[PDB]
């Protein structure tokens, strides 16, 4: 989107207007990310974030419940933009607007610099992921994880329903039996849609649930938040 990864961040994540469609949607996603990691007791040692692109907003609550976080992406350019911020380089994107937004949502217990630092301490590995592969992280060896988080990635990463099912199973390979799978994505309606989609309103919920059951997980919680949804599942 926009011209490149950075431009994309500049266009959508500066939080310049609380009423913009983008700020609205971040507010909804972060609200939910907060319930999942901070209210619903999703907790553990190691979390893998799959398809984290150049953004860190999806990890801000998560870094309170997880000793360590591994961020991954299909695109090496997203990863560089990310590292730029992680390593505190001079022309890193300013995350303060979203950071302090989350701080506020968490009850203004910490200010921005403490939340940023907490995230940096938790993130040590930055890795290529490909959801399509048997080994999502190829040759990288990782201890089994307590959580796999994938926000707005695996619906767009998988053209096929079969691939989507395969992907879930491939993601499963990273997880301790009993560990968490946290999916956020859209179920887009048929309106103004060009071409074809792998899921349907209220019915499509039941088909993504079926895909994840079939992939070797149980459904813990599914929440409607375009049809924006959460799905917490546990590996079998």
């Amino acid at each position: 989107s926009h011209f490149n990864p950075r431009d994309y961040l500049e266009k959508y994540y500066k939080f310049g207007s609380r009423h913009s469609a983008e700020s609205q949607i971040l507010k909804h996603l972060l609200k939910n990310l907060f319930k999942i990691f901070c209210l619903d007791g999703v907790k553990g040692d190691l979390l893998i974030d799959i398809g984290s692109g150049p953004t860190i907003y999806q990890l801000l609550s998560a870094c309170e419940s997880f000793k360590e976080i591994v961020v991954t992406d299909y695109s090496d350019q997203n990863l560089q933009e990310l590292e730029k911020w992680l390593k505190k380089e001079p022309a890193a994107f300013d995350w303060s607007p979203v950071v302090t937004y989350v701080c506020d949502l968490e009850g203004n217990r910490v200010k921005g610099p403490e939340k940023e630092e907490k995230l940096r301490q938790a993130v040590k590995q930055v890795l290529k992921c490909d959801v399509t592969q048997s080994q999502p992280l190829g040759a990288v060896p990782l201890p089994p994880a307590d959580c796999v988080l994938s926000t707005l990635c695996l619906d767009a990463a998988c053209p096929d329903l079969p691939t989507y099912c395969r992907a879930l199973r491939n993601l499963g390979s990273l997880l301790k039996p009993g560990g968490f799978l946290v999916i956020m994505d859209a179920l887009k309606s048929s309106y103004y849609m060009i071409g074809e989609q792998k899921f349907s309103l209220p019915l499509g919920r039941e088909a993504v649930e079926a895909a994840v059951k079939e992939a070797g997980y149980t459904i813990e919680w599914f929440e409607v938040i375009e049809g924006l949804f959460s799905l917490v599942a546990r590996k079998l």
Binding site: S1, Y8, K11, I25, L29, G53, P54, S75, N78, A186
Partner: peptide, 9 residues
């Protein structure tokens, strides 16, 4: 794309 990230957006 927003809320899809590059290069999916």
């Amino acid at each position: 794309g927003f809320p899809y990230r590059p290069x999916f957006c």
